[PDB]
Amino acid sequence: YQYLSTYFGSFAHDTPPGSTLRGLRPDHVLPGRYEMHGDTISTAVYVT
Amino acid sequence: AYAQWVIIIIHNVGSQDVKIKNLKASWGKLHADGDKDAEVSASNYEGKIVKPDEKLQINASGRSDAAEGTTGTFDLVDPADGDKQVRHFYWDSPWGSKTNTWTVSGSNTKWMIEYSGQNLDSGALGTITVDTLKK
Amino acid sequence: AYAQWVIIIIHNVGSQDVKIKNLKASWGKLHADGDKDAEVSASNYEGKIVKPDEKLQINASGRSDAAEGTTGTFDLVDPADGDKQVRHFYWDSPWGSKTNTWTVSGSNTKWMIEYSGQNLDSGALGTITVDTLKK
Amino acid sequence: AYAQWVIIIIHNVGSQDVKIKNLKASWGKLHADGDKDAEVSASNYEGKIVKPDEKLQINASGRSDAAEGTTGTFDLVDPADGDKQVRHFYWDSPWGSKTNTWTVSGSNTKWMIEYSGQNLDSGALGTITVDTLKK
Amino acid sequence: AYAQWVIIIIHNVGSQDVKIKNLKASWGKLHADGDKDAEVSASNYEGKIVKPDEKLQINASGRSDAAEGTTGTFDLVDPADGDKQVRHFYWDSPWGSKTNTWTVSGSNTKWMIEYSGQNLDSGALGTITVDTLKK
Amino acid sequence: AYAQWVIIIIHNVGSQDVKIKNLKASWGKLHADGDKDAEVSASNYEGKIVKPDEKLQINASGRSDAAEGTTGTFDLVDPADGDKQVRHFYWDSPWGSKTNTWTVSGSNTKWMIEYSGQNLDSGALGTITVDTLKK
Amino acid sequence: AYAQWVIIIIHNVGSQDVKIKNLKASWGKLHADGDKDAEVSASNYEGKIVKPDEKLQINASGRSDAAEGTTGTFDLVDPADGDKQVRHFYWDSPWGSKTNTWTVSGSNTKWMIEYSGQNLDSGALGTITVDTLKK
């Protein structure tokens, strides 16, 4: 299975909002295209 | 000698503050970045807080062309629980020996600490990068 | 001589493969990490693919007590673009001359290369981390 | 010497104006096209605007038969946003060394700059063609 | 000697193929780009087809420390017209004589050839870009 | 000399396998338990799997009356994680120098290693029990 | 001499109290942990109770640089049945002989005693660990 985003913070297994984050069956997703932001690798984020 | 040097890069890979305490160089001197001539006192780093997702660099080196290495210690301490110790770091890049020492002692189950880049065989102690993360 | 040494850590932070080519140590010798005695051949890295998030270490240093330093060159190329050159890297830590040299050349525009950690004043060249990314 | 020379051709491959600023030769002299004897002051090029789809040539060379190379710098600056820097160009074709220097520093994400034709091994610095394009 | 060198960049700006023939370095040696030590044979370029928008580089220079300069000839011919000669190119950067020589001969009228960048006063011949187009 | 000796008892207290690798006695010789005369080869332990609750003994000592001490190195690695290094162990009981040396290096974080029983002042290095566990 | 030494670790692997009695070193001296200079009287251990699941260490060694080994005895006694004997332990690491002696005499079917780590061939007597169990 797969999930569509990276977590910006500490992923909480048992408390919200981390308790409700879910991944998807592979047939639910198709490959996307990135869209980079930020001048430097330290602050580079893709907008899929 | 300047040939005995060490760079210690504290890099917060977590999301909680970490403090540097009790930084003390018994042998050698702390100095500026890329400038072994610009000596800096330990007060520049003691008590400083390394905010998450940024790095703090500590540069130590022996006296100029001397028969003296660089030996020092510091504590990394979590300020969120009354400045308890995370780990105690000790480095020793001597001038009259081959075996450099890099010891990370102490215990704190709430923190995970990794380090890489050190050289203990012979020569300088190198650039040690230490990634800290509060779990 | 072992006093002159260099470590190069290529880190493919990007999401597409990057290939090493034309690795050649004109002076000194390559060796396995932590063991300057354990010499290795350039073929152990030639043509290697650095997958995304993978790190590859190349360790070079002078020979046993010889008056030579170390010097070498290699290329990063893009396997997905017909091995089009990304960058050309040259390193030199001489035994006689005090100043070192770390040069990155090339004009590939769909790549970002960032190198850090080199020492150019005196002593060994040190450890250089080279983060690579494809736009 | 005249053997140390460099030609810098700024070629606008886009559709926006670009300006040359702070052109200064610390060593050597700017001269005319195909005429190393006709010295020209930097005022002939400083402040000039390279209109899109045309080329501007800057010729630098060392003093006649001297033990002096040619070292200089200039800025390429976008006039559309209050003369901010596009890139900073530095060239060095020394007489008493083999390694020529051609550095393009600075950052401007709104501009793309390519360059080709330089020689850094030995001898003259050659004819460097720099294509500038505003995105 | 390496002080005498020449680079020829044939650029087929047109829309039909052009072929190299009879490439011959009567003096000095050809070599790979950026490496005057890496000698190459004339067969690596003989009979090659320069497709439209393609660029082909030929690098020649004197041998190792020899008192020779460099001298060579080649032909551009039209593969689509029974290898009819387009142009005849001759280059010479002598070590003894100061003046260089770059000569283009021929009378093919359905082709446009434009060469630029040569130096004829003293020193190396330099870099010559030759744009080719078929009417 | 037999006066310098070391025994290493690896005890896998954990519940997953641990593998020995790169076992090498640079000085002295390995031997079977209770018989310093019965020399054994490093291949008798190389690549061995220490199952959970199993104990593995490695006995090293100096040769017959020679002025050498003993010195060796090995690695604990995780067979279930692509032979990823767990720890690097170095032992040295010199005949000339009085002080011994027992060094454990590495940064594997999913493992706990606890060594006890070494003697570092004078005489033989002694018996060292190394309890290993995987988190 | 200090080269003649023995460490005796009584480790209660059961759930019943065991007492040490009649500890007496006829030759040599009892000393502190890792400190052969800090002599300690036998009163520090005589009458002590080794609680289940913890270890008590007895360190004996010969006089400093003397021609004297270390010879001693003690009783392990069950206090639950009026201080009857479990086993009688005798150790002898002489200076003028090769054969060290480690004798565990006596009979008590209600107790099971194991011991390991002793060396009787030559040199020191080593670190003997004795696991005590009440069935």
From Swiss-Prot, chains B, C, D, E, F, G:
Name of one Pfam family that matches: Aegerolysin
UniProt entry keywords in alphabetical sequence: Cytolysis, Hemolysis
Sequence intervals crossing the membrane: none
GO biological process terms held by the UniProt record: symbiont-mediated hemolysis of host erythrocyte
Keyword Methyltransferase: no
Function: Has hemolytic activity against bovine erythrocytes at nanomolar concentrations in vitro. Promotes active pleurotolysin B (PlyB)-dependent permeabilization of membranes rich in cholesterol and sphingomyelin. May play an important role in the initial phase of fungal fruiting.
Subunit structure: Monomer.
Protein family: Belongs to the aegerolysin family.
Name the UniProt record assigns to this protein: Ostreolysin A6
Originating species: Pleurotus ostreatus
Name of the gene this protein is made from: OlyA6
